[PDB]
């Protein structure tokens, strides 16, 4: 019943090879719908879902200039963080950013997000109240003081409470056939004498999946991380060394528990 | 705050002027604007940490830069009559879209065909009326600066060597003495209202000061009349019972 | 490109009136919308900064709104004061550069409780008349003679007595010029004191 919109940004400095690589993607729930890659001949925000192609040219011109401005700012921040951490200009470094909003069945805001990461570790994050920051080190405290002086959180809070959920309600109504309709998985059990039993779940959306005589063997179970099939569906399996498998999903009418049919 | 030099600038066509700006201490970004009547306040150029970041409809004859000490410079070359405008300088802490800019006082530039029509002002002080003193129990002095060109004037009142602003009102814009002629000279009037008892005091010094911005000491002058240099013409009146 | 228009151009109102200053922009992809006030000699001073995703901002008697979907903004000024007299500039920030509007020149007239309008000849080829102490609704019109110069009304504030006064100056380097007929072209109040010896 809940929904979300998210934007992921990644800037990786390439010393001696030119400007950093900037890749950003946008998601509505687990459905990709926009992308931007700086390593394109004419870099521009591009559609990745059928329901976003309806947007006019003023949508794409604006989203493209937001990505071009975000890459520009991340280029400055990569050089700025070299000053903060006293690092060499010859080393590659990564800047990851993620922001978005969650809504419920009414379309009202549940939780807003905006968090940074420098070289795989947290940098600065907007707290749940959308008015304060949490810095992970003294370098992010420099950024926090600048972002508090410039009242950055007051615009991010205005976006997460306003434009973010308003954009989200629009995407849910346009692509309702593919976004507001879940798909249950196809299940089967295989046997591999060593012996092992593999409980499969294929072709389901969204990616949220959960896999003797009613008890759980949570420690002797090898659960591979959910993987995308490629057609906007997902896959996942679980193996136990030898006994029944447990399966739940949103699209499933009731939680099925399967057994190995010889 | 942001400071700009020089305050005023009278120049001729083909000349070149350099405008300077000291941003607020700590501000990394500087902005340059031009405010005219036909185009309004136009954004010209922005610098951030010494690098050019934004550009308005700046002309090729306009050159700017930001120095390592973060102060900026604006050169206007091959000057034309259309360049006569007010040039403002703003500064921001950085390039934040959530923060504001902080403007300076501005530099007013006046470009003339030739400096042959520049004239200093003749200022005078008119003593309060005896009828007004008896009728309203207060006195009004009036200052008239006349016959100056261009309208680069700043009138101030000085009661006993101290600039007064209470009871002082000055015309917001000068008036043309001959609105039929093009190079018409200007006139301006201001008022200082003191108390009727305060004016009867003879030991009070009233002085209308008009700072006039004409030519500079370094400017050429071949005409036979006196050089209309940037001068201060003052007229004074003293209290009398 | 981005076209910023402001309504109205000028505004002369009595003190205490609530004001509505509008702003229109054609490009809605904006980082912020600011309302500046410009005063002669001091420069621009930002009064409010509405963020990109904000719909309104408030600072004391100032309350501005923002509607990017329509490209509109309205600066509300409650209980206008004479100190608010300035040019109010609508500023907008786009991807490329910043844009400003024409501006609204505001003049807030102070109220004259009991006026005492009168014309006076001041001592001292110039000779000066003074139309003073009239109410804020008296329109000082231009002269029908170009040899007679008449300035517009100008309000001085005697702080030590909280006494604000309107005044207009007239002079003429021409003979046969008198102060009884100096401001003949304006709708002068009937109770105007005309001292005559």
């Amino acid at each position: 019943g809940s929904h979300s919109m998210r934007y992921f940004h990644t800037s990786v400095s390439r010393p001696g090879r030119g400007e950093p690589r900037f890749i950003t993607v946008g998601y509505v729930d687990d459905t990709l719908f926009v992308r931007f890659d700086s390593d394109a001949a004419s870099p521009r925000e591009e559609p990745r879902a059928p329901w976003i192609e309806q947007e006019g040219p003023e949508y794409w011109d604006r989203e493209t200039q937001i990505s071009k401005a975000k890459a520009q700012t991340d280029r400055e921040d990569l050089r700025t963080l070299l000053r903060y951490y006293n690092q060499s200009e010859a080393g590659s470094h990564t800047l990851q950013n993620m922001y978005g909003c969650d809504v419920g069945p009414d379309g009202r805001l549940l939780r807003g997000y905006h968090q940074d990461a420098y070289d795989g570790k947290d940098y600065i994050a907007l707290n749940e109240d959308l008015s304060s920051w949490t810095a992970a080190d003294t370098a992010a405290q420099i950024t926090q003081r600048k972002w508090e002086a410039a009242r950055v959180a007051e615009q991010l809070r205005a976006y997460l409470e306003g434009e973010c959920v308003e954009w989200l309600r629009r995407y849910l109504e346009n692509g309702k056939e593919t976004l507001q309709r879940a798909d249950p998985p196809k299940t089967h059990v295989t046997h591999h004498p060593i012996a092992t039993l593999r409980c499969w779940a294929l072709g389901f959306y969204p990616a949220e999946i959960t896999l003797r005589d009613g008890e759980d063997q949570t420690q002797d179970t090898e659960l591979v991380e959910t993987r995308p099939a490629g057609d906007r569906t997902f896959q996942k399996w679980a193996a136990v060394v030898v006994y029944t498998c447990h399966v739940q999903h949103e699209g499933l009418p009731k939680p099925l528990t399967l057994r190995w049919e010889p | 705050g942001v400071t700009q030099t020089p305050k005023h600038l009278i120049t001729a066509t083909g000349q070149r002027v350099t405008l300077r700006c000291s941003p607020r201490s700590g501000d990394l970004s500087v902005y340059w604007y031009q405010q005219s009547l036909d185009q309004g306040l136009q954004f010209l150029i922005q610098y951030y940490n010494g690098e050019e970041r934004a550009k308005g409809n700046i002309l090729e004859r306009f050159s700017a830069q930001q120095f390592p000490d973060l102060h900026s410079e604006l050169n206007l070359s091959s000057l034309e009559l259309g360049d006569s405008a007010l040039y403002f300088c703003a500064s921001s802490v950085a390039t934040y879209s959530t923060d504001t800019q902080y403007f300076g006082p501005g530099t007013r530039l006046t470009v003339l065909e030739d400096l042959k029509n520049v004239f200093p002002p003749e200022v005078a002080v008119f003593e309060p009326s005896e009828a007004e003193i008896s009728h309203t129990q207060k006195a009004t002095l009036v200052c008239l600066a006349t016959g100056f060109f261009p309208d680069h004037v700043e009138l101030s009142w000085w009661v006993n060597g101290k600039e007064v602003h209470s009871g002082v009102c000055t015309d917001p814009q000068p008036l043309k003495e001959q609105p039929a002629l093009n190079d018409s000279r200007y006139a301006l009037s201001s008022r200082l209202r003191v108390s009727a008892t305060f004016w009867q005091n003879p030991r009070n010094h009233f002085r209308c000061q008009v700072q006039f911005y004409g030519l500079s000491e370094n400017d050429e002058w071949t005409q036979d009349r006196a050089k209309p240099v940037t001068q201060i013409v003052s007229a004074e009146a003293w209290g009398r019972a | 490109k981005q076209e910023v228009t402001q309504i109205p151009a000028a505004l002369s109102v009595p003190e205490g009136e609530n004001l509505v200053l509008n702003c229109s922009f054609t490009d809605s992809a904006i980082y912020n919308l600011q309302w500046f006030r410009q005063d002669p000699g001091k420069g621009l001073t930002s009064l409010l900064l509405i963020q990109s995703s904000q719909r309104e901002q408030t600072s004391g008697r100032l309350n501005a709104s923002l509607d990017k979907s329509s490209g509109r903004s309205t600066l509300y000024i409650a209980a206008s004061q004479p100190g608010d007299s300035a040019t109010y500039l609508c500023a907008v920030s786009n991807f490329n550069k910043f844009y400003f509007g024409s501006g609204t020149k505001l003049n807030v007239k102070p109220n004259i409780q009991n006026p005492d309008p009168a014309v006076y000849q001041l001592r001292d080829d110039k000779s000066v008349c003074l139309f003073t102490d009239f109410d804020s609704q008296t329109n000082v019109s231009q002269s029908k003679d170009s040899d007679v110069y008449i300035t517009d009304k100008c309000v001085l504030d005697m702080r030590s007595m909280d006494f604000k006064s309107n005044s207009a100056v007239a002079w003429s380097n021409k003979s046969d010029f008198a102060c009884a007929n100096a401001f003949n072209n304006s709708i002068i109040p009937e109770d105007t004191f005309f001292p005559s010896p």
């Binding site: 401005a69 700012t73 921040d77 700025t80 976006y159 973010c164 | 959530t98 | 992809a29 980082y31 990109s52």
Partner: peptide
Amino acid sequence: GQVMVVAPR
């Protein structure tokens, strides 16, 4: 829709 913000670190 993305947020229009320029916030250097």
